[PDB]
Structure 1
Amino acid sequence: EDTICIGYHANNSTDTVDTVLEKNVTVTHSVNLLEDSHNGKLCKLKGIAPLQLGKCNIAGWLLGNPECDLLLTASSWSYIVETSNSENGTCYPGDFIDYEELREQLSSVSSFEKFEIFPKTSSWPNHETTKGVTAACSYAGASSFYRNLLWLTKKGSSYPKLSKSYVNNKGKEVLVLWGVHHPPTGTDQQSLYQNADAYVSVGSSKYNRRFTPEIAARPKVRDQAGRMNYYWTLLEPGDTITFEATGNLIAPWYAFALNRGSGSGIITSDAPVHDCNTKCQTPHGAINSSLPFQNIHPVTIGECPKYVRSTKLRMATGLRNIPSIQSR
């Protein structure tokens, strides 16, 4: 009696998946839909490396903090990486205005170039440039100051109104930073600027703003009762910025010129930066982005898979190894 059965053959498998009706079904094959591991390195996005600030943060690097001088810079970056030891920023106590905004707008830059906007040697014959350092910002044991800014002081019992202006003949935006100093007492006001009732005025064609010394008593920070606020502004290609003051100007020395990028951001990671590429960068490591979901970290940069809090997401495709109750 010739006989024929129709059924299905299943290969050996340990693969297990879940369905709505059963909790642990052994199928002969599944495809993982979840990205759940990372190479453990900060790679390059858009085929470019991130800016890697070393022992210091964006402020210390933008202003010329001394510790920061030990560091290199390239003409572009995808993103920026601050480490858990980038403590060196604004070494002289004070407030960085719109610090968060600046950090956002510098996250992807195209053609960085630092340049001497107001050369110390020649820009201030009537003011004193030589002196004007502080323990707060010290290099090689001695009192110093920011590499990118310059602390003007009365040349000798006088600080005549100064007025200098840059014009921006570069082809791109210029980021100009300065500071205003707030002595802790009117005596210091005199010692430094010899002008009790002084001011600082800064004017581009898109930026008017006045500044005055908030002379007041305050707690010491890095041994300084005095404070200084650091401001910034983006100068447009044809436009000119003009400074004008009778005291208290931590004048710009070097400015920056750059083309701001689409819109990256900043990652704080102690992982090592390597020369690999990634569509999706995470703080602990880079990840593949061919799968639609991922559980490494929600805070990501790139064309990334969706952060999901799942552990495993196996899509069954195979046959059951233990045949179903239906089939019996």
Structure 2
Amino acid sequence: DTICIGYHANNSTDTVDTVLEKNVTVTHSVNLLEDSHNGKLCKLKGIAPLQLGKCNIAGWLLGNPECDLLLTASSWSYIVETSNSENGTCYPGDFIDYEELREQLSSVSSFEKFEIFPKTSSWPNHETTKGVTAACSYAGASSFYRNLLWLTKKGSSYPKLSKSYVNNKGKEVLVLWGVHHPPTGTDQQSLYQNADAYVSVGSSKYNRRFTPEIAARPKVRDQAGRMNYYWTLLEPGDTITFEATGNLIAPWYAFALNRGSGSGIITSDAPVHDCNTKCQTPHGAINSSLPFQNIHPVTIGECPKYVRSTKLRMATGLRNIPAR
């Protein structure tokens, strides 16, 4: 009669590493590293993302012609640009503080678009129609942005305009506008008459004045002229006031912003589907409860910690010695 003391063992082939020895087979273990994904851009908490497709933030907000699809959008869980998001500023120029605008948009979950300055109403004495170019063509004909209005002299009569708006929305209002810089002094005449005009925007915290800088510059999309775009967030109660005498690409539509958190802009060419997730990445959605992941550093939602590791297996059982 005898009795022996021993320990479990099996056919397991999982291996872990230790400081003293590599590739040790153990009886049981757990993986802490998630490396698999959805392959698709999904919904976060029911709401779906906002594709810009061929458009970029600039195009979308400004109202570039090709981005009419986006016109109807009002809420999203995260904004998505792609490898071919080049439809934005159709008429050459500069978008002052563009990056800071994007950063602002990263904490906006939804807004309400509204005609701040009605085309046919807020502009008598000044001529509304006939403010288009080939640079921003449509269907084949010439056109312009759907949110900005190009005011030109009404029969060699460009009086000094002064329009204002009061923020009565209880939210923040995003106001965008532009300033034109014709190539030759001749054109200044034919567009706003007055040889030396000016534009002046102002509110409680904002104050800035612009003056045309006519000159000779290379052609971009068949244009030696330029156009700088601007923006600012009008606070609740405050009043913004434009006052120009030519060159003022005026605000036609504005947005009342809803600040939400945990949203953001991403660049991905992955297909959008009717799928819901708790963690999204540019490569696809993730669904794990593991502590780490090596899929992508860019994240939206609640994800595992990004890490460069290839393998992270933690032993639980003991050294597996079959000795069969």
TM-score range, shorter chain: over 0.9
Q: Deviations over 1:234-255 (max 9, x none)?
A: 1112111111000100001111
3-state DSSP of counterpart to 1:123: coil
3-state DSSP of counterpart to 2:170: coil
Structure 1 segments, 4+ long, off by >4 Å, are none
3-state DSSP of counterpart to 1:170: coil
Q: Greater shift after overlay, 271-280 or 154-163?
A: 271-280
Q: Deviations over 1:190-230 (max 9, x none)?
A: 11111111100011112111011111110111111110000
Query: Aligned partners of 2:289, 2:73: CA distance in 1, in Å?
Result: 30
Shift, 1:151, TM fit:
0.4
3-state DSSP of counterpart to 2:320: coil
Query: Aligned partners of 1:222, 1:193: CA distance in 2, in Å?
Result: 23
Q: Is the CA contact (8 Å cut-off) linking 1:42 and 1:274 kept in structure 2?
A: yes
Query: Aligned partners of 1:72, 1:227: CA distance in 2, in Å?
Result: 25
3-state DSSP of counterpart to 1:259: strand
Aligned pair 1:204/2:220, yes or no?
no
3-state DSSP of counterpart to 1:189: helix
Shift, 1:188, TM fit:
0.8
Q: Is the CA contact (8 Å cut-off) linking 1:51 and 1:81 kept in structure 2?
A: yes
* Correspondences of 1:243-282 after superposition (within 5 Å): 243-262=242-261, 264-282=263-281
Q: Greater shift after overlay, 259-268 or 112-121?
A: 259-268
Shift, 1:47, TM fit:
4.1
Q: Deviations over 1:48-76 (max 9, x none)?
A: 32221122011111011011013354332
* Correspondences of 1:15-164 after superposition (within 5 Å): 15-71=14-70, 73-164=72-163
Q: Is the CA contact (8 Å cut-off) linking 2:108 and 2:263 kept in structure 1?
A: no
Query: Aligned partners of 1:29, 1:154: CA distance in 2, in Å?
Result: 81
Query: Aligned partners of 1:170, 1:153: CA distance in 2, in Å?
Result: 30
Shift, 1:319, TM fit:
2.2
Q: Is the CA contact (8 Å cut-off) linking 1:294 and 1:308 kept in structure 2?
A: yes
Q: Is the CA contact (8 Å cut-off) linking 2:10 and 2:321 kept in structure 1?
A: no
Q: Greater shift after overlay, 145-154 or 277-286?
A: 277-286
1:51–1:230 Cα change, 3 Å: same
1:263–1:318 Cα change, 3 Å: closer
Q: Deviations over 1:68-119 (max 9, x none)?
A: 0133543322221001121100000011111111112112424411111111
Aligned pair 1:315/2:298, yes or no?
no
Q: Deviations over 1:117-164 (max 9, x none)?
A: 111111111111111110000001001010110000000112111000
3-state DSSP of counterpart to 2:202: strand
Q: Deviations over 1:297-325 (max 9, x none)?
A: 122233332221111111111222227xx
Q: Deviations over 1:264-310 (max 9, x none)?
A: 32110011122333332211111235222110112223333222111
1:135–1:8 Cα change, 3 Å: same
3-state DSSP of counterpart to 1:187: helix
Q: Is the CA contact (8 Å cut-off) linking 1:174 and 1:234 kept in structure 2?
A: yes
1:116–1:202 Cα change, 3 Å: same
Shift, 1:46, TM fit:
4.5
Percent of aligned pairs sharing the same letter: 100
TM-score normalized with structure 1 length: 0.94
Query: Aligned partners of 2:70, 2:96: CA distance in 1, in Å?
Result: 24
Q: Is the CA contact (8 Å cut-off) linking 2:63 and 2:147 kept in structure 1?
A: yes
1:209–1:72 Cα change, 3 Å: closer
Give the total of aligned pairs: 324
1:143–1:74 Cα change, 3 Å: closer
Query: Aligned partners of 2:186, 2:241: CA distance in 1, in Å?
Result: 29
Query: Aligned partners of 1:107, 1:263: CA distance in 2, in Å?
Result: 8
